[PDB]
Assembly symmetry: D2
Homo-oligomer: 301 residues x 4
Amino acid sequence: SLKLTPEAAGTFAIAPTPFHDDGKIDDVSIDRLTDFYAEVGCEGVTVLGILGEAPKLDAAEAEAVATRFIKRAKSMQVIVGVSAPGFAAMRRLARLSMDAGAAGVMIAPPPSLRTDEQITTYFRQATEAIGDDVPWVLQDYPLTLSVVMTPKVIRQIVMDSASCVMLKHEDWPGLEKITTLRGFQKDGSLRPLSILCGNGGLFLDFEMERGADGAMTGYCFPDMLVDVVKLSKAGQRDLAHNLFDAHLPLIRYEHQQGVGLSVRKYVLKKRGLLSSSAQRKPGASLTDTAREEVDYLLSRL
Amino acid sequence: SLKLTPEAAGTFAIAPTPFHDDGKIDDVSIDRLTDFYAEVGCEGVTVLGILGEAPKLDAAEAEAVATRFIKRAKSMQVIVGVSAPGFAAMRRLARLSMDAGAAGVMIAPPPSLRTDEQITTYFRQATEAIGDDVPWVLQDYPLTLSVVMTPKVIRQIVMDSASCVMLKHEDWPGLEKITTLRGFQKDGSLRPLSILCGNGGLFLDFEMERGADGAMTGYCFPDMLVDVVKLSKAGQRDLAHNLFDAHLPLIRYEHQQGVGLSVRKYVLKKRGLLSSSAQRKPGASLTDTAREEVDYLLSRL
Amino acid sequence: SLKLTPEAAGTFAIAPTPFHDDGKIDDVSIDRLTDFYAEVGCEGVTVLGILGEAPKLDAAEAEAVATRFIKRAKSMQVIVGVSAPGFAAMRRLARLSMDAGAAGVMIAPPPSLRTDEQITTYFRQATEAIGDDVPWVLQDYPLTLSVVMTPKVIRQIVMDSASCVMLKHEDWPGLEKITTLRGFQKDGSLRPLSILCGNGGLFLDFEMERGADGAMTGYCFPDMLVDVVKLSKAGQRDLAHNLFDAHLPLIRYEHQQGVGLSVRKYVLKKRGLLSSSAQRKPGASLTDTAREEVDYLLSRL
Amino acid sequence: SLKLTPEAAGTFAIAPTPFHDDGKIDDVSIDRLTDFYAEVGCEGVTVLGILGEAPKLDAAEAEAVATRFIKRAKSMQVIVGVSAPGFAAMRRLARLSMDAGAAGVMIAPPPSLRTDEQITTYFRQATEAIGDDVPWVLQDYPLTLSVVMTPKVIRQIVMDSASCVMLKHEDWPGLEKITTLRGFQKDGSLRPLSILCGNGGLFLDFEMERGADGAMTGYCFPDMLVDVVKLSKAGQRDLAHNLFDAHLPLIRYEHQQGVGLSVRKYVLKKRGLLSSSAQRKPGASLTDTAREEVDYLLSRL
């Protein structure tokens, strides 16, 4: 029932939507995944959106999935991705999620926005749609969304809003962006803002050093990134980097467009969290060889 | 209750979704628009999709709008745009529309498809989703959708399908594509296929000469394009081009991204078909000057 | 020998690079084209760049072509397109052109620029490259270059520069941009700036009304647009629009990507200005049917 | 003087173009880099192109740089990137490079190609331009070039050509592509073809297992990838992966757009190979913090 705040930190797991082979939602696995995240020290869970294959679900299914996760994660803050082609759908899912118990929602910009004018305007319209009372997360992921946001544009989006409390940092290269944003806070031009990093965790080791508050990861070993985040906050540089480096081979293997979801679901099933590694169409599973390669990386971990 | 066939021809009007200023759907205008299209000789109506601001409606609203149009156009074939981010939503709207009385549905490819392999695969998955029994229209509009489809790719998509009965031709330049496709039919590699042209009607005059069956137009004077199509089919080249040329100034003014919808709704309201020219956010109305310019073009018509 | 100024106005013809069938530069036609432009009242000529198939010429050829035009147009201001992948090549061609007698150069942004920060920075680097003493033209053509520049960004680019004297306006929709820019000049935030319009002349009729100074056109009848510009400046609205409307059918036919150059060269040859309508690879000529269609439009003119 | 063949294998170093702070080419460093590559076991060197900042050099400079490298690498095969906006420039640089002693040239497709028809056509025009006698390398790097080529399209490009002897594999995900291509060779539909991998070496460990012949790397430790390639060919899986994993942290840090070149030049200077880490505009050097981070990774190696 707690609203997301700018002080959010630690590790937020990005949850895939569990499916059986026929494509039906696997609720048992949703609960199992949720219990797992809590058990290993995750502070929150992000649901739906692209990684949760939300585009492959119908309106009613998306609401049910988001609700299942929200009700199960009683001790964690759940963030629901509400990015949509239009504001009506966004408002519906956002309000529903909040009434259900969500901590807040995540909003990514449409892929067509180019000028900084179009970017800031979109988000003002977006917040007007979901309501200024809804805590939200700004997703900055140029690699897949095309849109590029400068630190100054991000600062404007946040300060123009009543409730943007977090930035899901996925810019690549994006290390300097973190430093710049923290600098704005130091000079007083930017208010409190949580910065959780993504982009498959490819730069989590240095992102923590730059000043990120934690990670919002879809990595199949969120339990181990919990330690990377902890070690980093503890100033144990060598220990943090040693653990990160041990996971980097698998982190980068999973960090492949399309194949990434197949890798995640394959491992989560192998870990006993998912009953099936199935995805809904469009989506292809790992080849026998890719599975062996993933197994090899797992064996070295 | 008639299913769309490859013999579909004439003029199909692309209907905007009528809204009042508060953004609520204006059902009275939906009926008024529908009666208008029938009265002026239109053979069909295409609803929802981008031009109908479908992305700005929620699931329930889209279904209601599509249904309102289907039930009103008793003597015309109604095509419902079902393009969507995922197959579940597409299947829902497609089946609902068909059960309601739609003649068929329209499917555009996602903006990311590049290889011809990805294009043909997508549509096979798309038809599997809506059902091979549903007549559908392939939308080819590179200008706004980015995807480019060669005549051979189009031929494959059609022949791979059980029910693709029409191509909404919007390629630009696309005159040679029509000729090439008609050639495939002549040599026997392509079965019957209706070709209705779009892209704001910018090349309708020559598209008819190339062999198109008609137009699927969002132009504010569908009643006049009905005559352009008729004159063209009658071999009255000079008369057809004289009428087209008289409309070209306004056709091109309306053929502007973003401003186009504002121009259409402004004129349809002025013609007494819409109660309000309102659009839902995001969307901006015409400036006082743009309105005057449109008025000037109208006065010269 | 006159440098381009913010007071530049009238009609500037965009010259194609004349080639014979073997692909060799046709110098006789370059002189013939130049004499033609001067004879019909053109105030200037723009050479090289995409429309002049500059990407299909080697460094030495580009310099020779630009020079041939500069030396021939003794009574007109010649603008050389210097857009390039790098600043070294840009500086070379710019300085060479100026030493030869060019009035100034044109610079378009690379297709990757998205943030307004990247846009303004690029042009500051661009001017540093060619020299702050070189008068230049800012090309704004989103349709083909992808980059989008807001009026405020344009204002910054101009005011940040010592010598940006003109904007080649090709935004689409772009009528409001002209009005906004003229407004900045009225309020004093923007200094004198020439605005010549492009985008195939698709909106020249209204662009003149908005306050453009003239046209920079590649249209095969620059002689007739000279009159459209004159009539527009004379406040003869009906006469201006009547003449424009008579040309719109051909203007729009030529306004097709790829086919456009083929249409231009075909007509310029038919008008006796080019010995051959040949282009260098990659490039395809008009089909027999397209030629007939162009002939039909010409006959109605 | 040896021409590149389909049997090319091992490690090919992608050479940056050494510059001093004033931006002038540093020939002493070109020789030093070349001697280094030979000394550590590299089989070849690739010059110019994007990584060599070729777009920042003028025609004469590019030819001089390519020539300097060709003449110095007497015992290695040198590949010159000839990708260009037009065929004239491509032919000039290709023939010049071959006359100088190059083993072959590399050709990447323009960023606009989408249909497989456009892709295969481009390369047929490209080979016609440089001459069918010139051995060349097909660059497949969607991440930066946008163009996507299916294995079948690649097969067609190769079989349509008289001299395409190598594929610079940079697809991501691209492991299955290697397997598919090797399969075509097994079934006889694809002739001998060298496959050297790129994309910063992010997947070199598994690419070798899939059947790649080696690497074409811009990584600052080409000497160590020489061993990774050797260990991989020797079937020493654990040793190969242990060494790769030790370098992965730095490999991924350098694998950042824009920052990548700064990282490479910074390290190559620190290794005593470059006098200066300077790049030509546009290009920014590493911040003090980024330098420290790179130093940290280096210290752990």
